[PDB]
Amino acid sequence: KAYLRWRGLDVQITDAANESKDNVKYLATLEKSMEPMYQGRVTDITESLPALMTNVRMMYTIATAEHMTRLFTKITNQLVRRCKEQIMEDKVTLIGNMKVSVELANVYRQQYRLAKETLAAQPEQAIFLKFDLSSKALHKLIDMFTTIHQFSSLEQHTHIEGLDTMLKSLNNIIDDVKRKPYDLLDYSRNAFDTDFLEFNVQINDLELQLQGFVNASF
Amino acid sequence: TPEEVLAYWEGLKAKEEQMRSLVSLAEQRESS
C-alpha cells in the first residue's frame, strides 16, 4: 500500500541527490574567488570580478535560469552591501567613496554585458532595479556635494564686508536638507528627489546673489 | 532512451570543452 509511494520517493530522491551533487560541486568551485568580497575593500572587487565571470562563464557552459537569477541577485546584493558599508564610516572621503562605488557598478555592468555578448558569440531585472536606484541616489548626492564643495572655497573669507550672513544662508540651505527624516543613502524612500530640486534653485539663487554683489561693489 | 542519449552527448561535449578550457588556462599561465 505504501510501496508505490516509496518507489516514487526513491526516484525523486535519486534525481534530487544527483542534481544536488552537481550543483553543490559547481557552486563550490566558485567559492575561492567569491570569498574576498565579504569583508575586504571596495576597490578590490574591481580586480576580483574578472575572475568571477571567468568562473561563472566556464560553469554555465555545463548546467539554468535559477542559477543566473539567484547567483546574480545575491552577488549584486553583496556589491550593494560592500559599497554601502564603505561609504558609511568629510567631502573628499564622501566623493571618493561614491566615485569608487559608481565605478564598481559601471565595470560590473560593462563586463557582464561583454559576457552576454560573448555568450551570444560562440554558439537583467535585479541588476536594472537595484543598481539603477543605487546609481541615481549616488549621482544626485555626488553632484550635490560637488557643487557644494565647489562653492565651499568661499567659506573662510569672512573679513570682506559683504560675505557675512550670506554664508549663513548657505548653511541654512545645507542644514534644512540635512535635517530631514529620510536616510540619504537609501533608495527605499525616493522622496528626496523633490528636496534636491528645491535645493538646486536656491543654489542658483546664491549664484545670482553673489553675481549681483560683485556687480554692486564696483 | 532520448534522455540517456542527450546525457551522453552532453557529457562528451562537456569533456571536450573542459579539455579545450584546460589548454587555454595552461597557455594563459605559461604566458603570465
Binding site: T29, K32, S33, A51, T54, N55, M58 | Q18, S21, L22, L25, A26, Q28, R29, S32
Partner: peptide, 12 residues
Amino acid sequence: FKRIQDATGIED
C-alpha cells in the same frame, strides 16, 4: 577540479 585549480594557480 583540474580547471578550478589551473584557474586559481593562474590568478595567483
